[PDB]
Amino acid sequence: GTSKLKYVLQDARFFLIKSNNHENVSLAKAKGVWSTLPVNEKKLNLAFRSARSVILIFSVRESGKFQGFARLSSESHHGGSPIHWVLPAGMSAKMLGGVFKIDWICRRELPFTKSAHLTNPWNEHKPVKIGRDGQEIELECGTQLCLLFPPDESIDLYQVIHKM
Numbered sequence: 001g002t003s004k005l006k007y008v009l010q011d012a013r014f015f016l017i018k019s020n021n022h023e024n025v026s027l028a029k030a031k032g033v034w035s036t037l038p039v040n041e042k043k044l045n046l047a048f049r050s051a052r053s054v055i056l057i058f059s060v061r062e063s064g065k066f067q068g069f070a071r072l073s074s075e076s077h078h079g080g081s082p083i084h085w086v087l088p089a090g091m092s093a094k095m096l097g098g099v100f101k102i103d104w105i106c107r108r109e110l111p112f113t114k115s116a117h118l119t120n121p122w123n124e125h126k127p128v129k130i131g132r133d134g135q136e137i138e139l140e141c142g143t144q145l146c147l148l149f150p151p152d153e154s155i156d157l158y159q160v161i162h163k164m
């Protein structure tokens with residue numbers, strides 16, 4: 001069912017994550033972590049302290065889909081075991097901010113064709129699929145996007161609800 005999902009999404013904030021490649025989303029799915037540029041790191045840390053749930057929705061550029069979404073379980077922290085991201089061409093690992101711990105809520109994909117009726121008021125009401133890495137999605141658009149995903153029956157939101 002979708003009731004616990006709606007509970008988790010209640011009054012959440014949502015951020016669009018655009019990844020250069022699948023390997024980074026797969027690393028994120030396996031390790032439960034994400035690391036972003038400092039400009040987005042600062043926004044996520046502010047948002048983490050401000051709301052009951054901060055949701056990251058991932059899209060690999062040129063894939064035509066979202067690859068799932070996850071909930072921030074910590075602020076960014078430095079000094080962990082280094083994560084072997086496949087960084088974009090001109091980018092080095094030092095340019096990255098700290099590491100966020102995340103809990104996955106949905107590891108299934110969703111094609112953009114399924115979200116074409118959703119527009120993000122925080123990006124000029126363009127379709128929610130359009131946006132730079134780190135673009136915030138307004139509450140209602142964000143919730144309806146997450147509800148479009150196929151249910152991920154591998155996941156139990158009971159532990160996530162304990163985190164809030």
Ligand SMILES: N[C@H](S)c1cccnc1
Nearest residue numbers: 024035036037085086087
């Ligand atoms: N860690 C991933 S590869 C990433 C790279 C650049 C910006 N944001 C996230």
